[model samples]
Target chain A: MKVAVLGAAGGIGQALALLLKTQLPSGSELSLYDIAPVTPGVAVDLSHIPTAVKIKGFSGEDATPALEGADVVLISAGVRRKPGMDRSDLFNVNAGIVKNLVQQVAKTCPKACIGIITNPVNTTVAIAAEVLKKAGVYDKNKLFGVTTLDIIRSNTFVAELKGKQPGEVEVPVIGGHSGVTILPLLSQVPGVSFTEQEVADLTKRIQNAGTEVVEAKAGGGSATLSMGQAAARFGLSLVRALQGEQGVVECAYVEGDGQYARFFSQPLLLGKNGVEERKSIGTLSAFEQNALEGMLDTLKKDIALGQEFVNK
Target chain B: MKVAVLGAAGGIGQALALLLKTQLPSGSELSLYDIAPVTPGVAVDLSHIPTAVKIKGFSGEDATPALEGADVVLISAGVRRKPGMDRSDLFNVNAGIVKNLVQQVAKTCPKACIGIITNPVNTTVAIAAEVLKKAGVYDKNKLFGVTTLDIIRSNTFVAELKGKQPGEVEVPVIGGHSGVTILPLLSQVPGVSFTEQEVADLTKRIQNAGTEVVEAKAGGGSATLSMGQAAARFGLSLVRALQGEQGVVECAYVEGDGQYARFFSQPLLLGKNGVEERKSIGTLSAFEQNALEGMLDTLKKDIALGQEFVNK
Candidate 1:
């Protein structure tokens, strides 16, 4: 697999690129690009590691060299969100960034599995989709708003409460990637149970985990390491699927296709063509159902706002 | 294994700590400490990852709790070097910082394998040894100055030139961890042929790789990503050895016991006690022998500087 990381000099970009360097298959090549002049330095730093992957650095207004012939392109370039800030406020800057990058990807490697890690993923992903559509190379299976962090946080928090290994727990978090729209199906977790209070607490914690990091950092930054882990997880899943692996399931924000919302987070079965199958949200308890229902309106608005931005 | 990361909020510390959280063997507990208040925030950020390792954060002057039962302690706390500045200038501050932390470690967890990632490692590792000795718990086998980045760079640059996978190339980089004292034994590598020019060019590149990054970053900072990778490599190698895995060899700066310099970087066979076997430096080519002889004066000076700081 050949992977290209857009904005590879940013906090999240550098980290996710590091993880990708370590985990990607032996024959893989990693192309790292950023508008910053320091990006090549980051790539050189990572290239010194004894990982099997090959890394090359590119920087400039154009991202063509990075995107060319890439099997996967992960975009994490844009302004970062701070504590007390809304993801929507990120829309103006990040939406344009995402649109421009996606335009380059459409022209250069349209079939590539694109994972967006920029803030306002619900909207930026929609913006990406619209950009690809205008370029006439949109594929639902190939585009994703990386939201694996939500599921990861839920699994971790649940495992901590249940006294199990974090890796051993799987929590299906669906809806969207923002506050109220991020619905965690605590009821569907296998071989575990939670009290009503536990469910309520865990669900809310998962939704606000980004804010938790933001506030904890006290404006230093927001969730770079965890976000890197999440982007890596999403990128690796896409790689595995593209390499013909089976049963690779991950939750990401993508087009709803009339399932739940215009843009929603759901379980996806990855395959050779990117997303081979879309799994249902499965069953939900009354509490989970109510939470999911309540999130739809907000999620719809988020998706529409993204589409409107791209249309303009 | 219980790993304590002193200075866990800094660049290399945070990256290395994140890697440890994700990669450490199941049931491992990671204790992170820093004088900076953001230390706990870093731990909180990492805790969201769905990894089996348990993480806790501690900040301020009290490192006793973090060091209490750590099987391994990796120190990465210190001020960073900026462009056109002397690394020696950092000695006054980092030496005292390292000494104070080592004093705490000596009292709280004297048995922990301590890996020092502070700059001027040739001196800092010696400082750590002196601190432990004063505390009456010094063990030459238990102290390490992380020089894996040099070896990592040698392996990678050699692989790039040879058109082979980096994982397939094992270069023994022996000497100290900085400037001319850092030597790469190109002649010892198996299954690769380097012309005299290649050897000279590659050796210089590996030795100056850190500076290359510092210059490339152009005052942004030094090699955090690569440093993190190197620290992680060293930490993981120690973990595997402590877990009873055999045949793990990494280059690190440690007490030479009169066999080489007072402090030397050499390939060490890691085991439960940290360095179960210090392998022979092996035969060197004429060019390598010349380089080795040239570096001794500088290496001796660096080692003495560290020892003198602790002595004073």
Candidate 2:
């Protein structure tokens, strides 16, 4: 298996490269790229680790070589959030970065499973879809907005509240990936229970987790480390599924069938073709159901905003 | 295994925490501390990962609580060197940080195997040793300067030159972990041969690899991701050694017993008690021998500087 990381010199890109280097299956090759020429040095530094996975570094405007023959491509290429900006505000700069990179992905390895970790994933995944569509190689199953971070935050927060091992907790987050549109299905988690107030508080907490890190960083940086872990988790799950592994499940934002919104995040069972099964967002409580419905308007707007950017 | 990370919110600290969270032995606990208040947030972010390692966070002046019951401690606390800044200049800030933190490590978890990842490790390891010695719990076998990054860089550069897998190459780096003093024993490396010109070029490259990354990053930051990788390798090797795993060999700087120098890095056999065996520096090519001998004066001065500060 070969994995390519775009923006491989950025904060999240460097870490994502390291995690994939150490954790990817033996014999896997990691191709790293960034506009910054520092990327080759980063690749050389990571290559020193006594791991079997091979790593190569590419730099400057053309990331096409890195995308060549990639089985899984993880994109974290874009400017990061500052102290006061919201993810929506990042779309102006990041949307084009995502579109151009996906254009290269379409030309280089159209069948590759591509996971976008660039900000405004709710929009960038849409941009990627439209670009791939224009290139005549759009595959809904293979394109994902890397939202496993939300599910991870939900799982951890609930586990802490319930005094359970985090490893034993599984929470399915649905809807879009940002702001109020991000939805956590607390009621659906197994082997744990949350009170009504707990549900309300925890859902709000999960939705605001990104902001929590942003504020904590105090203008220094945002949630690069955790985002790297989330992206690695999503990428490894894709790799396992690609390798014919069984029962690999994760949650990610992808093109929707109008189940709730045009582009929604929900539990996905992965397989060789990317998403083997699109699990329905199951069984919501009345309160949860109401919140889910309430989020749809914003999610629809966000989805429309993304589609319009590409169409324009 | 209870692993505590000091400076858990810094670049290397955060990356180390993420790697340890995923890679440490099962049923382990991770405790994090830093002067920065964002330590708790970093811990929380890492907890979101599905790994079984339990994580706790501590911040500010009181790091004792995090160090309370650690089995192994990794210290990455202190300011990073900016471009055009001499590492020697960093000693004033980092040495104090290392001293204060090792003081806490002495008081809280005196039995913990301490690995120092702070810069100017040639000095900081000595400071840690003197601090532990003052507390009367100093174990020469346990305190380590994580020079493994130098060794990792050496192996990687050689492998790239030989067109071989990095994992298939093993290079022993001795002397110290800094500019000019880091000596790579290329002659001892298995299954590869280097011309005198190749030796001179590779040796210089391996020695200056840190500066390479620093210059590559163009003062944005130094090598955090790769340093994190090296620290993880050292920490994991220590964990395996403690678990009674056999034949775990790595290079680290530790107190010398009249070896080549008073404080030197060499191939060590890690075991239940830390460094069970300190292997010889091995046969050196005339070029390597010349470099090794040339480095001793600088390495000795660095060690002495550390000791003088501790005593004062």
Candidate 3:
């Protein structure tokens, strides 16, 4: 199976390629493409490691050549949010980036599960969906905003407080992928319970963690490592399910209309053709329920902003 | 499950701790011990993540306090080998590091799976075994030289060479961990066949690949990212098996006389207490068999050197 990563030259891109280079099922083909210098050299560099995967690099504005036969196309292209610029403002730039890439993704491997790692993800995901929809190849199931990082980060931090493993501490992060829209269900994880202070602190931190990284890098790189981990997880989940692994579900921003809002962040069961199953938000703690309600306006606006961009 | 990582402040150490911090089973406490500054800050920084794993950091000697109840202790201590330095000369430095660390490990978590990730693995593995033997707590099964990085690297490279996915490619890397002693059983790998040139090139590349990174960094760092990937794979396998999942085995260096000389590398099934079952070197190609024979002398000398060090 061929896995193509757009924007394979940036911080998150290189890290994601490296991570996938090591993790994808052995013997998998990794196509690394970027409109930057010596990307083929990047392929040569990673290829020397002796992973079971075949890798080649491509560089150019048109990524359709790279996307042609890929089973999973991960898009991480766009201008990063600058200092003092909120996620929504970054959307003014990334939305167009997502539209252009998804157009080619739709044209080439329309059957491929396209994961959007471009921000503002809450809107960019919908932008990809609209572009795919316009191309008449939109499978709501195959389009996803890679929100696995949020849950992954959520699980990591919650595990820290609760003294559990990150993978073992399965926190349910619901609603959307941005500040107020992000919600963490701290009470639902099995065999684990968090105090109210732990819940508030973790929930707020998860919601604002991206801003923290952006601020930490002093506005240079925004959560590159964590973002790479998230995209890699999504790509791996896609590969695993595509290879017929059972029950490969993850939390990703997807094109779906349920209670609360459309194109919202939710837990999903990924399968052969992408999102094999959709699970509704399970019972929530009163605090969690309140958090969800408080998120709808922001989440709904984010979705509308993305939808409007694509509609235009 | 408690996972303690020794030398948690160095390059590979820090990355491994971060990876483990995010990956260990939820509610599993992560104890970070290092001899360097910034370990406490690292724990604090990682603690910001919402994972359920409790986080704590300790510096200086007697890290045994952290290892006291660890289910698995990953040792990433010792200086990496530099260019122009062969296994024997570097042993003086790394062996002592491993010796002091393992002595403490034996007293604290004698029952824990003592994973040795120190350099000259072919030798330090012997040192670790002898240390445990003298401590009167040696369990051949519980002692492991983490060779999972090699398998992970070789697996991905082979997958990249072929048009297959990484996870689908399973190439069993046999023999020891360094130079000619590291052998990839190409013939035994099903669905994959390589030309003699590909085999020779790939084999030689994997055997001495450490030099690529050692030379690449021009002396600053050595293969930390790739090493982290490898160590993470091994740690995950240990967790899975310990979590009661079955049928997980990869090559590792251990105490034994059956292979090539006294102690050598072979495939072993990892279980709760560490190695659950051992598999003999599978049928080999003429090329592989010849390589194995040629590698025996160097490997035997390497093993003997470590054993002699501890015996002294």
Candidate 4:
């Protein structure tokens, strides 16, 4: 098996690749592609682990060669956040960046799962979908917004509350991966109870968790470690689901015509075709429903903002 | 929800706690209990994260105050690996440490799910089980080996090899967490195809991946970040399962009769109880069978080493 990470030289990309290299099944080929010269060095550095995974790093603009025959193309290749900057603010550069990359994804490996970890996922995911659709290879299931990080934080926090293991916490984060739209369904989860105020507090935390890290790091780095863990978990689950493991579900940003918005991150059960089926929001309590309703106007606006960019 | 880390002062414990603080649900109380006086500082440090979770740290033998009313007790308190030693050598000190800690665990919160990250896991787990058994609170389903780190490594590697997002790689690791016993099922994964030889090579890397990290650190450190990520991943997963998401499965070492040995890690489908059902190794290929056979003798020896100390 060959796993290729585009823009593997950046902060999130390097950490993600290092994790993938160290945690990958030994003897698998790992291709690291970046626009920087240091990419091969990153590959060489990781190859020293003796995990038996062969790593090859490619640099410069010609990503076609780097992406050849890949199964999953994880794109973290774009500008990141600065102080006081939000994910949506990253759209200017990252949106264009995501556009070119998805174009390559369509041409090189149309069947591979396309994961966009770049910012402005609300827009980039739509862009990726449009590119694939134009390329005559659109499979909604094969494209993901990599919002697993958001879900990861949500589930992790919920687990902490129960003093249960993180693996046990499964709060499905519904909606987009940014402010207002990010909704964590704490009520549906059993064996746990959160106060009404606690529910609102936690839901807000899930939405703004990424900014907390950006502020903490204060520009030193982004949420690489946790995000990497989340990304890795989602990736591994996909491997299981792709291999015919039934009933594997995780929250991810996906292109769906669900209620309220066109492209949204929802709880999805991934199968061979990507999302085997898109499950509804099961059931929401009054508080949750109210929060959901309260957030949709802004969420729709966020979606419209992204759609407008691509359409124009 | 109260989450307690017994050895919050240790290297792995600190990393584990930090990750926990970040991912733990908002307003969930976090307690860091270490023997060192630095416990409060650690709590103070994490408390500033602006999340909903409240944190309190405590030090000393009378950590029962800290442990009281805990929902989860994660014991990472034992001695870590040193310059010239493997896990077994840490057994002498860790066993006694675990015995004493389990006493506190039994006294303060016997109902909390116990995740044993202590060394000589095969034995320490038994010691924990015995102590809880004596306390009349021994529930097999509530104890876990926290072998999610190994599976996380395998998943990461497979994702890299298969050229997919690390967030999408899914490989369920089985057997004990230590050397030679860990098994990564690569053949069954989707989108990633490793040849027969690749399987043999990849499995070896997953089994001994820890040694690789320990050596790479030149004995300065063990696989802390990666392990932290894995531990956090497992912790989160358990949180999900406990939340009643249903049917969460991963690998961990537990008291599984004489299946492979008295103590061996295997894939478990988690339920309201810790392990609702323990899955067998299923079918083994010639290589897998041979590897399992080779592992049993060592695993049996490891289990006895753990058991003898507790009995004495």
Candidate 5:
């Protein structure tokens, strides 16, 4: 499989590129692109690793070369949310960045599985889909707004509270990718139980986890390392599924098909063609059900704003 | 094992911390220390990774809290080389940083195996030794100057020419960690023979690999991702050896016992103790032998400069 990382010089992009270099399957090709001149250096730096991945880097505004014939395209290019900046504050810059990159994705690798890591993911994903659709290459099943970080954070926080191994804990996070929209289905974690208060506290923590890192960083940057891990996990899962692996599953924001909203996050069963199944969110507790219901309006608005931007 | 990354907020440190978060053995504690206020944020970011390792961050000049109970400490804290700056230009600052941090390590976790990735590693490793010795906790077996990057680059460049898998290729690198001091033994590579020109070209490439990245970066930064990978590989190997896994062999710059330079990089057999045995440099090609002999004066001076700084 050939993987392309757009914005490979940014904070998230660099970490994501490094992780992909370290873990991607043997014989895979990793293509990196960024507007930053440092992108090539990042690629050369990673190229020295003993891994079997063949890496090439591209810089300048055009990412066409990087996207060419890629099986998976992960977009992490855009401005980072600084101190006091909400995900929405990132919308103006990141939305345009995603749209342009996805336009190239549509032209160069329309069949590639696109995983969007730029914020506001809820909107940028919609912008990406619109760009692909306008290019007559939209593949709803293959487009994803990576929400795996939310699930990872959920697993970590829940494991911390339960004194269990975080790596072994799995949590299903649904809804959109920000704030109240990030709904953690705490009731569904296998072999675990929680009180209502525990559910309330854990749910809030999961929702605000991005901001937690933002504030902690105090304007240095947001959650690049964890986000890189999340994107890598999601990207690898997509690669695995595309390679005809069995039983691959992950959570991502994709076309909601009106069962919920225009775009929503859900558990997906992946296969050779991309998403094979949209798994049920499973049973939700009262608090979770309430959260799922209340988050849709905001999520819908976020999706609409993105679609409108592309249409405009 | 508890591992502390003293420069955990810098480029190499952040990527190194991320890798350790992903790959360290289950139940390990990852302690991060940097003078940057962003260090805690980096820790909080990595803490969200669904890995078994528990992570904590510390900042300020003193790394005592991070060093406490640490079984291994990887130091990557120092200024990076800019476009025109040589590794020797880094010595004035990085030497002091290594000395202070090693002093803390000597105080808090004296028995912990220390791997130094701070540049001018040829010198910083010597500074580290002096500080530990002054504290009366020096263990020659436990302190290392990580030169694994040189070997990694050698393996990669050789594998590229031989059309072999880089992961499967092993090249023993000896001498020190900088410019001409970095020596790659081409004759010792199993199952691969190199022409004289190939040896010279590959050796030069391996020696100048850091500059390759630094120049590619063009005033952005030095080789962080590759260095991170190298340090992580060395750190993991140390952890494996400390856990009594036998025959874990890696090359690092350490006390040479006057076999070559004051401190030299050579293959080491590791066990419960840090360096169970310092393996021989093995047979060298005439070209390699000449290069090794020519590098000693520079390598010795680097070592002496570091020791004199601590004593002065």
Candidate 6:
């Protein structure tokens, strides 16, 4: 398989590319692209790794060389948030960046399974869909707005509170990828229980985890290492599914069929043709039901904003 | 198990820390220390991964908190070379950095297996030895100058030329971790044969691989991702051996006993007590023998320079 990483020189892109270089299937090719002049060097550096993955790096504004014939394309290219900036605060710049890159993806490798890691994923994913639609190669099953980090944080936070191993804990996170829209179904964790207050506090912590890292960074950058791991997990899962693996599942932001918002995050059962089945949110507690109901307006607005950017 | 990364916020350190967080045994504690104010934030960022490893970050001149109770300590905390700078050009700054850090290692986790990734490792490992000796905690079996990157690069470059799998290729690298002092045992590669020109070309490339990255980076940084993989591979091998895994062998620069140089890189058989046995450098071809003889003067000079730094 051939995988391409757009924005391969930024903090998140570099880490993500490195993980892919080390972990991707032995015969896979890892293509890297970025606007940074250092990108080719980054590729050259990663090439020295004693892994089976073949690697090549491309620089400048054009991404055609990297995107062409790719089986998977992960977009982590965009500006990072500074201190005090919310994900949506990055909308204008990141939206345009996502649109331009996705336009190239539509042209070069429209069938490529795309995982969008650009900021404001709630909207940027919609923008990607619209761009692909304009190019007449849109596939609802293939494009994804990566929200795996939310589930990762939920598992970590819950594991910490319960004295459980984080790797053994699994939590399903749903809704949008930002702020109050990030709803963790805490009541659904198997063989565990939480008080109402515990549920409320943990849900809020899961939602604001990105802000926690941004504040901790003290203006340096947002989360890169964790985000890279999250994205790699999602990308690898997609690769497995595309390579005919069975029963692979992940949570991601994708187009909805009018059950809720135009776009929503939900558990997806993946197969060779991208998302094989969109899993249900399952049973929710009173608290989780209320959270699901409460998040729709903002999530709908976020999806609308992305659609309008392309429509305009 | 606990692993501490001194200089955990630099380019190499950040990447190395991320790998350990994901791959180290479950329940491992990854302690990070760096002079950069951003070190704590980097740790916080990594803590969100849904792994069993617990992470803590410390920043400032003192490394005592991070070093305490560590089983393995990896020092990658030194300035990277800029354009036109050789590894020796970094010696003045990196040597003192290694000395100060190893002094703390001596005082704190004296028995911890140490892998030095600081530049001019040919000299810095010697400097580290002196510091530990003065503290009366020196153990030749435990301290190492990490030259795994040289081996990694040799495997990759040779794999490319041979069209073989890089992961499946093994090329032993011996000598100090610097320009001419770096030597690749091409003839010793099992089941592989090369013409005289191919051997010379590959040897030259392996010796100058760091320079290749330095020039490719164009003043950005030198070999962070590849070097990170190399260091993590060595650190994990040490951890495995320390945990009583048998027959683990790796190449590192360490104190030589009446060998070609005072400090030399050679394969070591590791056990619970670190270097259980210093393996002999297997039979060398005429070309390999000549190269080994030629590198000794430069390697000895580098070792003496580091020794003098502490004595003076």
lDDT of 2 by residue, B9-38 (tens): 887897888889888876899999988877
Best-matching candidate per DockQ: 5
Q: Can you rank all candidates by lDDT, best first?
A: 6, 5, 1, 2, 3, 4
DockQ for each candidate? 0.72, 0.45, 0.14, 0.03, 0.86, 0.82
Lowest lDDT block of 10, candidate 2 chain A: A216-225
Who wins the lDDT comparison? 6
Docking class of 4: incorrect
- Model 2, runs deviating above 4 Å: A58-62, A79-86, A103-111, A134-137, A161-164, A186-201, A243-247, A269-272, A282-288, B78-93, B104-109, B132-137, B158-165, B185-204, B242-249, B269-294
Higher-TM-score candidate among 1 and 6?
6
Model 6 chain B worst lDDT window (10 residues): B254-263
Give the range where candidate 1 chain B is weakest over 10 consecutive residues by summed lDDT: B80-89
* Lowest lDDT 10-residue stretch of candidate 3 chain A: A216-225
* Total clashing pairs for each candidate: 0, 0, 60, 59, 0, 0
**Candidate 1: tens digits of C-alpha lDDT, residues A1-312:** 899999898878888988998888888999999999888888877887888888899988999999889999999999977778988888877888888888999999999999988888888888888888899999998888888888888889989899987889888888878888888888899999889999888887888888888888777788889889988988988888898888999988877577677777888888899887778887789998898888888888888898898897
What lDDT score goes with residue B59 in model 2? 78
Compose the digit string of candidate 4's lDDT tens values, residues A1-312. Answer: 577788887756755675676666655667888878656655544554335567888888888887888877888888868669878888887878887888888899899887888887777888788778888999887889888877667766776666776656667778877777788888888788988888877877777777776665445445654555667677777766766788999888887776667777777888876788777888889988897888877776766766666667
lDDT of 4: 0.74
Rank by DockQ, highest first. 5, 6, 1, 2, 3, 4
Better of 3 and 6 by lDDT: 6
**TM-score of candidate 5 relative to the true fold:** 0.97
lDDT string for model 1 (B141-258, tens) is 9999998888888888998899987888888988887778888888999999889999898988887788888787777778888889889888999999999998988888888676
Query: Model 6: what TM-score?
Result: 0.98
Docking class of 2: acceptable
Q: Please state the Cα-based DockQ of model 6 relative to the true two-chain complex.
A: 0.82
Ranking by TM-score: 6, 5, 1, 2, 3, 4
How far off is residue A87 in model 4, in Å?
Answer: 1.8
Q: What is the per-residue lDDT of model 4 for residues B8-123, given as tens digits with 9 covering 90 to 100?
A: 86656766776787677655777888878656655644553435567787877787988898877888887657556777878767888888988999988988888888876766
True contact recovery of candidate 5: 0.91
What C-alpha lDDT, on a 0 to 100 scale, does residue B249 get in candidate 5? 96
| Model 6: residue A73 alpha-carbon error in angstroms | 1.0
TM per prediction:
0.95, 0.87, 0.64, 0.54, 0.97, 0.98
